[PDB]
Amino acid sequence: GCPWFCIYPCKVEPICGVVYASRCPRACDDD
Numbered sequence: 001g002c003p004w005f006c007i008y009p010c011k012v013e014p015i016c017g018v019v020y021a022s023r024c025p026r027a028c029d030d031d
Contacts (some may be wrong), residue, residue, distance in 0.1 A: 004030035 006024030012017040 002031055007031065 003023050005019055006028055009020065
């Protein structure tokens with residue numbers, strides 16, 4: 001299943017970008 005951090009992105013980087021990369025493995029299959 002996809003993590004909600006990756007499903008519901010935010011527009012404030014790099015704090016969102018860092019967590020995005022770390023909390024969205026290929027497991028999500030890009031939704």
